[PDB]
């Protein structure tokens, strides 16, 4: 059987809420290097990835790689029991499915739940392999504000970056929007290998940016007409990844 312990129930629950269009069912993949879920929307525009590197997994006992399909709702029900931020989640494999356990050393309490799961072949992380010419890090609250901005105007979002400035532009029926992200305002870091520019669906971008608000260190990368990568880390190590295909 497979065992796994994560140092935070709150963060684990925050990552799951980030899954856009979950379908109420996910396939948790247990591998030697990480536990992860890999979802791709029907339009194939957005890829959602939930990932927890082994580096952040305690007492991780992995015999053979396994993928278990479960109801994400049942998984959320048990995570909700966590009252403190010092809570801990433990995933144990069973014949019927999963055994999720939430214990907190503080009040020395525990909570069990036997989720009916259908195990199957393991999925692989087939992420776009490309050189991200431009990367920057910002608090998710900023991206959420810009999401609100884009809500007022725009059909497509053109994001570009010169030597040290990132710009987001949209147009719609005469109206216009254009924000400027520089370092220390608000960007915590900005790395430009070369002037790059690309266009993404304002609808998808909006939905994603709203979710990144769960992190203070969101990393965004992109390049000339290549998919955009959005990393949403947590203090406990858990991480959401979003890949957004460009409009060409």
């Amino acid at each position: 059987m497979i065992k796994a312990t994560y140092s935070s129930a709150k963060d684990f629950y925050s990552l799951l809420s980030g899954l856009l269009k979950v379908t109420d069912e996910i396939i948790l993949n247990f591998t030697e290097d990480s536990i992860f879920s890999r979802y791709l929307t029907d339009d194939k525009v957005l890829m959602v990835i939930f990932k927890i590197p082994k580096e952040y997994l305690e007492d991780y006992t992995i015999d053979k790689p396994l993928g278990i399909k479960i109801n994400i709702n049942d998984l959320k029900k048990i995570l909700g029991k966590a009252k403190s931020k010092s809570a801990t989640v433990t995933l144990e494999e069973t014949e019927a499915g999963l055994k999720v356990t939430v214990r907190d050393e503080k009040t020395g309490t525990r909570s069990n739940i036997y989720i009916k799961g259908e195990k199957t072949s393991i999925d692989q992380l087939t992420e776009p392999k490309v050189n991200l010419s431009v990367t920057f890090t910002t608090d998710g609250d900023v991206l959420k504000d810009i999401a609100r901005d884009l809500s007022l105007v725009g059909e497509e979002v053109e994001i570009s970056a010169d030597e040290n400035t990132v710009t987001l532009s949209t147009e719609e029926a005469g109206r216009t929007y254009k924000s400027l992200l520089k370092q220390d305002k608000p960007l915590k870091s900005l790395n430009v290998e070369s002037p790059s520019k690309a266009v993404y669906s304002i609808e998808v971008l909006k939905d994603v940016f709203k979710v990144t608000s769960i992190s203070q260190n969101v990393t965004v990368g992109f390049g000339n007409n290549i998919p955009m990568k959005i990393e949403v880390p947590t203090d406990s190590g858990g991480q959401l990844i979003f890949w957004i295909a460009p409009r060409l």
């Binding site: 900023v142 105007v153 216009t176 400027l180």
Partner: peptide, 10 residues
């Protein structure tokens, strides 16, 4: 404020 943003109206 936190960042610079510009809106344009016809």
């Amino acid at each position: 404020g936190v960042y610079e943003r510009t809106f344009t109206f016809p």
